[PDB]
Amino acid sequence: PSIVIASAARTAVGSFNGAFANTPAHELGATVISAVLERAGVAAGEVNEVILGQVLPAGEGQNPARQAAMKAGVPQEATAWGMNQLCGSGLRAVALGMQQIATGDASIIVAGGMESMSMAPHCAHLRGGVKMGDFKMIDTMIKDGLTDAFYGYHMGTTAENVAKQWQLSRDEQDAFAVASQNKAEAAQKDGRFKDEIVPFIVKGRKGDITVDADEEIRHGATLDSMAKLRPAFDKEGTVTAGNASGLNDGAAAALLMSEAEASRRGIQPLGRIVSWATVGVDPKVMGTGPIPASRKALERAGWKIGDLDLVEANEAFAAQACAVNKDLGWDPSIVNVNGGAIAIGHPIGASGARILNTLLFEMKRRGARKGLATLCIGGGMGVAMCIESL
Amino acid sequence: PSIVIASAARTAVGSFNGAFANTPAHELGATVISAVLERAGVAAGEVNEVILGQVLPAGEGQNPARQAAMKAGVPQEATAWGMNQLCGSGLRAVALGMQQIATGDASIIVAGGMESMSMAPHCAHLRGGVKMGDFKMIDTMIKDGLTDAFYGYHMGTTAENVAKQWQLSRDEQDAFAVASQNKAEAAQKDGRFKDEIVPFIVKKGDITVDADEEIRHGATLDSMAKLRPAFDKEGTVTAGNASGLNDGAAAALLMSEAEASRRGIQPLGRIVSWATVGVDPKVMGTGPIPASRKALERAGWKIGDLDLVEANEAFAAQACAVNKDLGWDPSIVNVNGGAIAIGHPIGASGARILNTLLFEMKRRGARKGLATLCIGGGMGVAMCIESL
Amino acid sequence: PSIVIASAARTAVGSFNGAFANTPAHELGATVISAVLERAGVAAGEVNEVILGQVLPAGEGQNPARQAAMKAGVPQEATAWGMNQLCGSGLRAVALGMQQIATGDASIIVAGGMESMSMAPHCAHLRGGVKMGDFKMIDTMIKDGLTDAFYGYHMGTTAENVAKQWQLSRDEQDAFAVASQNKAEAAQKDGRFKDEIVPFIVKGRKGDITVDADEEIRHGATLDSMAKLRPAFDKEGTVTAGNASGLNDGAAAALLMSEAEASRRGIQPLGRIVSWATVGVDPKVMGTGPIPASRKALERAGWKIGDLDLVEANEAFAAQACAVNKDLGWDPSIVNVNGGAIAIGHPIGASGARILNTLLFEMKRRGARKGLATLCIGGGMGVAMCIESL
Amino acid sequence: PSIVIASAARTAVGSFNGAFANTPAHELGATVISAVLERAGVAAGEVNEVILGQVLPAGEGQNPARQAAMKAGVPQEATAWGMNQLCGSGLRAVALGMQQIATGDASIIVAGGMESMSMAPHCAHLRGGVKMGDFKMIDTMIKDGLTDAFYGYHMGTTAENVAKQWQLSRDEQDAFAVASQNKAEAAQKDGRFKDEIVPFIVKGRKGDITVDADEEIRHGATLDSMAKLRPAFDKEGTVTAGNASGLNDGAAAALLMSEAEASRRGIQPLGRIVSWATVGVDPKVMGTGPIPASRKALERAGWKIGDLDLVEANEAFAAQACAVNKDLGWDPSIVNVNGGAIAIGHPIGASGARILNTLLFEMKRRGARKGLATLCIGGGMGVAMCIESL
Ligand SMILES: CC(C)(COP(=O)(O)OP(=O)(O)OC[C@H]1O[C@@H](n2cnc3c(N)ncnc32)[C@H](O)[C@@H]1OP(=O)(O)O)[C@@H](O)C(=O)NCCC(=O)NCCS
Ligand SMILES: CC(C)(COP(=O)(O)OP(=O)(O)OC[C@H]1O[C@@H](n2cnc3c(N)ncnc32)[C@H](O)[C@@H]1OP(=O)(O)O)[C@@H](O)C(=O)NCCC(=O)NCCS
Ligand SMILES: CC(C)(COP(=O)(O)OP(=O)(O)OC[C@H]1O[C@@H](n2cnc3c(N)ncnc32)[C@H](O)[C@@H]1OP(=O)(O)O)[C@@H](O)C(=O)NCCC(=O)NCCS
Ligand SMILES: CC(C)(COP(=O)(O)OP(=O)(O)OC[C@H]1O[C@@H](n2cnc3c(N)ncnc32)[C@H](O)[C@@H]1OP(=O)(O)O)[C@@H](O)C(=O)NCCC(=O)NCCS
């Protein structure tokens, strides 16, 4: 039983403490869940289950995926649950939502991701009591999403490990980030992000403001200031504040159904899910995650690396993104033709489905047959999925 | 060709701030992952992916399921991820792990759950800054796991809604709790929990915990009726007729039936069907009602075909309502007690009662089983197990 | 046996989270102590003891008055201690420092106050441990300085008690506040605050910023905003954000010595301490605090109410200041001739010595013989001190 | 003008997280204020001012000394204020309260101290906001009372400096602590603490518990276990957990009035205040504080070191207490005859008046003519007072 993606949508990737500074993740997800159903003509009462990945749900209440579904009109008879595979959470939900229909336990699935790093609180265990001495108020964003629990250093330090073994110079990493910014400004001005972005109305006390543009994109990004930034994680390192992904808020999802179910409704699906794969690697080089994951996904689909017509590779770091391209050897001209996470933004829970939206809508805009989306997961993991157009 | 559970294990359900007061959830899961692999002869290097549900991972670091796997010997080549469907997380992970092998994306899966409510921290958003006035330190246990986000009241209040429409008196609810307590002490003294419980070494000297500490030995009824109501001053649910706050973990080994025959393993049970259905968030306790009816429908079984049933006892009112609704024989429901006496680790109760379900079916020679739980927010999960 | 004030100084009263947002209280006191000694030619090695009042020292370390003395050059041979009588702390230290020389236990005393509400932290008791339930992180500024411990409501509510029985309308209180606002900036534009204010150097990473003007003073203070403000503490109250004192940071002190000691050093003192008094009242009507305190101070000095040439009355609230003026019957034209704490600012621990600086430097500028400074203290108390010219 | 102490009282010195774990400081002070007034026959309506020292008032509300007076029956007509001179606060209030009557501004003064380290909260500045990164919740007890703000280390580290320069071996400090322990248990069993200790009723929902015994005193303290304790502040140091004072809660005060007023009331006073002194030293060697302070106190009174019949010297640390004994040369058999703070306990805000209660009641118990109480103050200071019997 095949399984096609009938429609997809996503919110604009906001900056850290920016447009979505006080917007909970489920409010951004409910807007997406309401958007994918309109773009396919499917009603909310037909959704069997909503599957939204999220890495930082602290303070959001019971089951944030349930709140995003109930507010979006999904009836109480349906179910909802969350997931945490770090940066591959948004894309794995599409794979998990695909398995719900593959086994015959569901027919219509809204799968994607959501994240709100601006709403990430500070936590500390105080049940036993602090009899004497100062204690730490732990930032859940840095701890539960940006700090490797096995070695203790930041996700930028494991990128320094990728910056050493592959021998990627500072100037080469700066040229990859600035190129990603220019590819983002060109696609945004040409309206290539309008199809994927659904407007979100940020209700405020001083008036509602509709946000529909990726705020992280720097207009007129130069290179003389890219080399003037100090390294953030190592005094003698290469990763800085510009060549790495930032902290962002946003959401993204898609509508999942069988191919025979879409043909009955007369729906033209965005793409066909042919295969998927997830492989783990050394936690010191988590950025190499997409390397075995993409090779396993293509092997399951029966495709050669040269068979791909379009590729979306999440740009968590400049060193990590260059290393994956230099190993797989795929044509960089078809990789992130509209930019990547360095310019658009990196919502951990939503980046998996965010770049999948960019992957789907760009394939039909250009008429591409075969695609491949993949991301690197912290702790030494990687996820990948292949999409073929209808 | 199906999908069987080769082995299963769980830690002793500790009390809130008790034996596992300072033990992280992934430390309890690694012991379970090491136990399910030991009881089936499967090595850690053969696990493709571990799927462990957890509701309160705040402060535990990146992917607690990944930490529990690396310490248990699972190699870095395997993958790991967490999931949150509240109370049905432990049982849904088995269903999710079942789907990994059904589509052919994996061969060996360690699926279960874990929870550590004692390690649940207090949180507060402080990025924007508090210029003036005091602010609230939010308990992640109460907020993210025990408070309905749609109506605002506690999960004990949703039991009052079930206590009214079915008209279940406090004395009947008190008789259900005391009966569950007495049925728990019988199994603990008789060593019927020893097979499922794997000892955990809590590192002034190491203390090995291997017995469910929440079980009250000699629970009476004169004190059950003297307790004040906990969630409503004119309510019926108290501290004895409702589930408590507990820490623990539980998991199982998932593999194909044709894969078990190659290893010469005698599996605990075969996963025949599963289902998850949502209900009115005002009556979340009714969750197992449509979930159990759909699970039997997919497998093709009548309610009377079941030989053993494990129904999580989140509250006395919700557990009594499901029994009066499904009409199954109560003598085969929670034969060794329930969550009122053993304990209710939210993320692990789904796989906890599955361990009690699996080990009791083979101990007695039962053919067909059914485990189910009630999920907050108006949801319910259920799974059916057939013996080999 | 007399005791004269040889010199005095104070820093510019900064706004809440304004210029002194990150300046500790002892840094503001050290600048004053270095200023109190330099303007009189007295060296630091001659100071017997420094007495600085402070209400919110949480998080500043052991004895902030000791830190303010060591940084100002006072040698280790001297002693230091803090004091807390709420709002009358700055003026009480001068009375306490006067008693050190009166009994013969000291010769040179640097007495004053300091406050830094911007650095006031949030606190919560967590030694016993919070096993279950949410708990509150209490602001030390509101709790230990702005909340009456006997009845629980804010200091704005106890001003409402003066606003009800005394029957002071909002429009009359707004006319009293606007008059105080206009009188404060006039002294700033005419440079009437330059002599008493010592410049403070706010050390910054992007360059040092010298602060020498009271920023809390509203430039061009009109009445169009005074009548449009909603009540702050009670939906049916009269005190708002304009007619009440604000939250401020600052410090102030003075040099205390015997009259025969100033003549030996050839110092012309600012004023002679003639008497002082502190009397308690009903905590519900703390604004009446200065009423019995001033009557006892004049009685100890032997002066009638009509003998006063200049009066400084701290403006904690518009309602409390109006009630004191009509009961004592003194001429309002000599009361707060250069404005008050509503416009200049109200550092609780320092306002006692702040208005004393305005009292001291203005008496000879105008040729006043006798003065009287007073403040209202929360919890039903009042402080007063009388000053005679040399 | 003389000034006698008509009566005095104190609560039992509780252990850290012990009997007074959740008892606020003002509740402990109110019991003392009500006891000192009853033991002298003076009514509450005659109290002119209450002077209570406290070092950690964070979280207790506006003026904890005012709360302890209002609950103890002191009428609103009286005033109250706090002070912070660290460990010498309790004894300095008696000296400051003495100066109130010496200058003629008061007649009856209730002076003393109080402390409740168990109720000391954790604080953190959060007005500016924590955009990213973890932050510290600072323990006010360790920071504002147990950490020198000039060098950063604990008060045990400056005791290590006293343990080095004077060349005090570990065995000598251990022999001093065990001797103080034995002298404390003997006085408690012989009922020598019953007169000074007033019972405190800890009201609780599960029943009231009357506390009337110093809980910190270890019954049967040997030296074989004193040498088995690890050093607390330096891995190669001498100060441990047994030879140093602990963390404690409690209160203490006294009644101050003129000598001619006590004869009219038929009151037999405990002693006559002849002199007092406070001198500062190097904060690195605060333990030498009592050395010049006690020599200056005797110098003002006109007494030789050999004229003293009884001496109370606060035992904050074994090294500092031995150093004072080795310099002054007084007979150690008359110094802390009933033990010290090493065994009884060290409430910072109350230890100044705590040892004064032990000093006063012991002079009449044995018939001693002249006494002397002194303490070492953090930050390089020391306080001392001389007591003559009537
Ligand atoms: C790197 C990180 C710490 C950035 O926070 P930061 O250190 O404060 O740096 P900022 O992004 O806030 O910007 C800081 C400065 O860099 C400059 N800058 C940033 N990006 C730039 C760019 N792309 N081009 C030019 N200048 C840039 C800004 O103008 C700013 O200048 P300023 O200091 O005068 O204000 C944060 O984004 C991070 O942790 N990333 C980790 C990525 C990650 O973990 N991914 C996980 C996937 S596995
Ligand atoms: C609130 C809650 C945590 C109980 O905490 P609690 O109110 O402090 O009650 P406790 O369990 O700590 O025990 C309190 C008292 O009950 C008494 N008690 C407890 N269990 C008893 C029993 N089984 N029989 C008789 N008496 C009992 C104890 O002696 C104790 O007396 P004490 O207060 O004098 O010490 C519990 O009601 C709860 O919320 N459980 C979670 C339910 C839930 O949300 N489940 C979700 C699944 S959908
Ligand atoms: C009155 C008080 C409560 C105000 O706190 P606040 O309102 O939360 O702080 P704000 O700055 O936001 O209020 C100021 C607002 O009014 C406006 N405003 C206030 N006074 C004004 C004036 N005099 N003229 C013109 N505009 C004015 C400001 O522009 C600002 O704009 P906003 O309405 O959009 O917020 C504060 O001054 C206070 O704490 N008073 C009590 C002090 C005290 O108790 N002292 C001890 C007593 S002895
Ligand atoms: C040592 C200190 C830093 C903290 O240590 P601590 O956490 O209190 O030590 P603990 O209470 O946890 O227990 C210490 C051990 O020593 C033992 N011990 C302590 N004092 C003892 C004594 N006087 N005699 C015999 N045994 C003793 C205790 O029984 C305990 O045994 P344990 O190991 O089984 O716990 C603290 O006590 C201290 O010295 N604070 C300084 C106070 C201060 O400086 N005030 C200002 C004065 S200038």
C52: Cα separation from own chain's centroid:
11
CATH number at residue A364: 3.40.47.10
CA D322 – ligand 4 centroid, Å? 19
CA distances from C37 to A181, B39, C267, C373 (A): 60, 82, 12, 23
Residue ranges with strand state E in A203-288: 209-211, 248-258, 271-280
Of C15, C11, C12, C9, the closest CA to residue C218 belongs to: C15
Indicate if ligand 2 lies below 6 Å from the C-beta of B237.
no
**Cα separation, D248 vs D385, whole angstroms:** 23
Q: For D241, which DSSP code? A: S
Are the C-beta atoms of residues C314 and C346 closer than 8 Å to each other?
A: yes
**Cα separation, A267 vs B324, whole angstroms:** 45
Contact A139 D124 (CB under 8 A): no
**Cα separation, B339 vs C8, whole angstroms:** 73
B273: Cα separation from own chain's centroid:
18
**Cα separation, C232 vs C242, whole angstroms:** 10
Q: What residue numbers bound the domain in which B291 lies?
A: 3-120+245-386
Report the first-to-last Cα separation within chain B, whole angstroms. 13
Contact D59 C119 (CB under 8 A): no
| 3-state SS assignment for residue C133 | coil
Domain assignment present for B147: no
**Read out DSSP for A16-50?**
TTSTTSS--HHHHHHHHHHHHHHHHT--GGG--EE
Instruction: For residue C17, give the ligand nearest its CA.
Output: 3
Indicate if ligand 1 lies below 6 Å from the C-beta of A242.
yes
Domain assignment present for A365: yes
Residue ranges with strand state E in D258-307: 271-280
Indicate if ligand 4 lies below 6 Å from the C-beta of D227.
no
CA distances from C329 to C62, C132, C295, C326, C375 (A): 45, 57, 12, 5, 17
Are the C-beta atoms of residues D192 and D183 closer than 8 Å to each other?
A: no
* Secondary structure percentages of chain D, helix, strand, coil, to 5: 35, 25, 40
Helices (H), chain B: 25-40, 64-71, 89-102, 140-146, 155-165, 170-189, 257-263, 288-299, 316-326, 339-342, 349-364
| 3-state SS assignment for residue D183 | helix
Q: For C174, which DSSP code? A: H
Domain assignment present for A81: yes
Environment class of C194 (CB within 10 Å of its CB; exposed 0-12, middle 13-18, buried 19+): middle
Indicate if ligand 2 lies below 6 Å from the C-beta of B374.
yes
**Cα separation, A353 vs A373, whole angstroms:** 9
**Cα separation, B371 vs B289, whole angstroms:** 12
Neighbours of chain A (3+ CB pairs under 8 A): B, C, D
Q: What is the 3-state secondary structure (H, E, C) of C247-301?
A: CEEEEEEEEEECHHHHHHCCCCCCEEEEEEEEEECCHHHHHHCHHHHHHHHHHHH
Domain assignment present for D339: yes
| Cα angle value C121/C124/C125 (rounded, 5°) | 140
Nearest residue in A to C132, CA atom: A127
Of B302, B262, B256, B278, the closest CA to residue B380 belongs to: B278
Domain assignment present for D188: no
Nearest residue in A to D138, CA atom: A134
Angle between helices B316-326 and B288-299 (to 10 degrees): 40
Single-letter code of the amino acid located at A5: I
Count CB neighbours of C299 within 10 A. Answer: 12
| Cα angle value A43/A49/A51 (rounded, 5°) | 115
- Give the number of residues written for chain C: 390
Indicate if ligand 4 lies below 6 Å from the C-beta of D51.
no
CA distances from A272 to A253, A275, C355 (A): 15, 9, 78
Environment class of C326 (CB within 10 Å of its CB; exposed 0-12, middle 13-18, buried 19+): exposed
Ramachandran quadrant class, D61 (left: phi over 0; alpha: psi -120 to 50; beta: rest):
left
B337: Cα separation from own chain's centroid:
13
B287: Cα separation from own chain's centroid:
14
Contact D58 C58 (CB under 8 A): yes
Minimal-distance CA residue to ligand 4 atom 11: D241
Q: For B121, which DSSP code? A: P
The DSSP element (H or E) to which A325 belongs, if any, is: helix A318-328
Indicate if ligand 3 lies below 6 Å from the C-beta of C247.
yes
CA distances from D75 to C388, D51, D100 (A): 33, 15, 19
**Cα separation, D10 vs D250, whole angstroms:** 8
Are the C-beta atoms of residues B210 and B194 closer than 8 Å to each other?
A: yes
Of B94, B71, B86, B81, the closest CA to residue B117 belongs to: B86
> Tokens at residue D259, please?
């000598």
**Cα separation, B321 vs C193, whole angstroms:** 78
Domain assignment present for C180: no
Q: Which residue has the tokens 């000391």?
A: D120
Are the C-beta atoms of residues C373 and C319 closer than 8 Å to each other?
A: no
Q: Phi first, then psi: what are they for B129, rounded to 5°?
A: 95, 140
Contact C63 D128 (CB under 8 A): no
Report the first-to-last Cα separation within chain A, whole angstroms. 15
Mutation site, C49, C76, C79, interface D, largest D CB count within 10 A = C79
Q: Which residues of B touch C139 (CB under 8 A)?
A: 130, 132-134
Q: Which residues of B touch D130 (CB under 8 A)?
A: 126-127, 129
Domain assignment present for D87: yes
Indicate if ligand 2 lies below 6 Å from the C-beta of B143.
no
**Cα separation, D247 vs A321, whole angstroms:** 56
> Tokens at residue D47, please?
């109290």
- Resolution for this experimental structure (Å): 2.6
**Cα separation, D198 vs D234, whole angstroms:** 38
> For chain B, what is the radius of gyration of the CA atoms?
20
- What number does the ligand 2 atom closest to the CA of B318 have? 48
Are the C-beta atoms of residues D15 and D76 closer than 8 Å to each other?
A: no
Q: For A365, which DSSP code? A: H
**Cα separation, A251 vs A111, whole angstroms:** 11
| 3-state SS assignment for residue D170 | helix
Single-letter code of the amino acid located at B220: T
**Cα separation, C159 vs C146, whole angstroms:** 12
Of A17, A122, A132, the CB nearest to D142: A132
**C379 min Cα distance to partner chain A (Å):** 32
Are the C-beta atoms of residues B349 and B90 closer than 8 Å to each other?
A: yes
**Cα separation, C332 vs B25, whole angstroms:** 70
Single-letter code of the amino acid located at A82: G
Are the C-beta atoms of residues D319 and D168 closer than 8 Å to each other?
A: yes
Count CB neighbours of B270 within 10 A. Answer: 16
CB proximity list for C152: less than 8 A, separation 6 or greater:
none
Whether residue A123 lies in the annotated active site: no
Whether residue D26 lies in the annotated active site: no
Of A255, A275, A267, the closest CA to residue A370 belongs to: A275
Single-letter code of the amino acid located at D235: K
Which neighbouring-strand residues pair with D198? none
Active-site hit among B122, B154, B217, B374? B374
Bridging pattern class, strands C49-53 and C109-116: parallel
Q: For A85, which DSSP code? A: -
- Mutation pick for ligand 2 pocket among B245, B312, B374 (CB with most ligand atoms within 8 Å): B245
Are the C-beta atoms of residues C380 and D63 closer than 8 Å to each other?
A: no
Number of domains in chain B: 1
> Tokens at residue D55, please?
């070092």
The DSSP element (H or E) to which B277 belongs, if any, is: strand B269-278
Single-letter code of the amino acid located at C363: M
Single-letter code of the amino acid located at C387: I
Single-letter code of the amino acid located at B200: F
**A15 min Cα distance to partner chain D (Å):** 13
Buried b (16+ CB within 10 A) or exposed e, D118-145: bbbbbbbbbbeebeeeeeebbbbbbbbb
Are the C-beta atoms of residues D383 and D374 closer than 8 Å to each other?
A: yes
| 3-state SS assignment for residue B337 | strand
Environment class of A75 (CB within 10 Å of its CB; exposed 0-12, middle 13-18, buried 19+): middle
Minimal-distance CA residue to ligand 1 atom 32: A229
Count CB neighbours of C390 within 10 A. Answer: 14
Of A199, A214, A252, the closest CA to residue A361 belongs to: A252
Q: For D89, which DSSP code? A: H
Minimal-distance CA residue to ligand 1 atom 11: A241
Experimental technique behind these coordinates? X-ray
Indicate if ligand 3 lies below 6 Å from the C-beta of C245.
yes
Single-letter code of the amino acid located at D39: R
HSE value, Cβ hemisphere, 13 Å, CA-based, for A243: 32
**Cα separation, D109 vs A55, whole angstroms:** 62
Q: Phi first, then psi: what are they for A210, rounded to 5°?
A: -85, 125
- What number does the ligand 2 atom closest to the CA of B231 have? 37
**Cα separation, A32 vs B349, whole angstroms:** 32
- What number does the ligand 2 atom closest to the CA of B238 have? 37
**Read out DSSP for D212-224?**
-S-TTPPTT--ST
**Cα separation, C11 vs A114, whole angstroms:** 51
**Cα separation, A152 vs A148, whole angstroms:** 5
Of D342, D315, D324, the closest CA to residue D246 belongs to: D342
Are the C-beta atoms of residues D163 and D176 closer than 8 Å to each other?
A: no
Bridging pattern class, strands B269-278 and B379-386: antiparallel
D154: Cα separation from own chain's centroid:
19
| 3-state SS assignment for residue D315 | coil
Contact C130 B139 (CB under 8 A): yes
Of C311, C331, C327, the closest CA to residue C375 belongs to: C311
D98: Cα separation from own chain's centroid:
17
- Give the number of residues written for chain A: 390
Of B378, B282, B289, the closest CA to residue B327 belongs to: B289
Contact B132 C142 (CB under 8 A): yes
Contact A122 D139 (CB under 8 A): no
Are the C-beta atoms of residues D11 and D260 closer than 8 Å to each other?
A: no
Environment class of B233 (CB within 10 Å of its CB; exposed 0-12, middle 13-18, buried 19+): exposed
Domain assignment present for B111: yes
Environment class of A1 (CB within 10 Å of its CB; exposed 0-12, middle 13-18, buried 19+): exposed
CB proximity list for C316: less than 8 A, separation 6 or greater:
C87, C155, C159, C244, C245, C287, C341, C346, C375, C376
